Design a protein around this ligand. Sequence first.
Ligand SMILES: O=C1Nc2ccc(S(=O)(=O)O)cc2/C1=C1/Nc2ccccc2C1=O
Length: 276
Amino acid sequence: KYHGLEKIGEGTYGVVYKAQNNYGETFALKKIRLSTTIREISILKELKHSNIVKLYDVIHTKKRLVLVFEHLDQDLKKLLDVCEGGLESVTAKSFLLQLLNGIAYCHDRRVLHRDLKPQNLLINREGELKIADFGLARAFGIPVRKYTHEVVTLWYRAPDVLMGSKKYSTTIDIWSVGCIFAEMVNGTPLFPGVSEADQLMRIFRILGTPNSKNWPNVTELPKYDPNFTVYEPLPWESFLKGLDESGIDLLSKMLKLDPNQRITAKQALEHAYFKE
Ligand SMILES: O=C1Nc2ccc(S(=O)(=O)O)cc2/C1=C1/Nc2ccccc2C1=O
């Protein structure tokens, strides 16, 4: 039994509330908006990691369903909102390293998250970051929910996906980490599109329009357009303020447009930018 519920968040498939149990301990309660829930729970049961939110139980009334989770005070979106255009370097490095550890573990366990964004990245007062919201995730090829345009935001979607690739891949999440990385350093989203078409153009405007030299077989993508406006790639220093050479190198390897060229979570953790 839980009480003193207070709305702290809202996604598409449920409302999240802060609540107390009968001993005064705080948890997060996700009321579902009524098999998709069973698939999400199976993922949460499988994944046990410092940087992934823990599920504690599931209460099934006939007219009510609630997932009980550990509670974190904040998410990254709120930290960025209050923040003066971007976090401090040491903090940004710390969140990225934790995000990378969490996602590397996910990928090792055959889980694609597919909806990483500041809102789904939870942070406590100790500066620990935990990945949440596996409602669009995919575990060894079986989706929690069918991946589509309409629900999910566009801002953190990879160019290949936007152009109609149904080629699943861990690559989808690496693209999102890169966008989130950029947003932590600048304080603002790198690619805030309001449609699929505008999202792609925003990506090309900064990183350059793909061609067959830098993205082999790009012409085969369902929504590749021969007549895309051609944009040259921008120098990384011109749209990222105050990121050192190593941080730019790592970032350039996450936001490769061609998914085959993107760095892996595992390789990223080994990059000179962190200790190693
Ligand atoms: O403490 C938490 N535990 C969980 C667990 C699961 C989710 S989920 O995204 O709904 O899956 C969200 C949360 C959660 C959240 N804590 C907060 C605090 C401020 C703003 C938003 C959220 C939030 O979504």
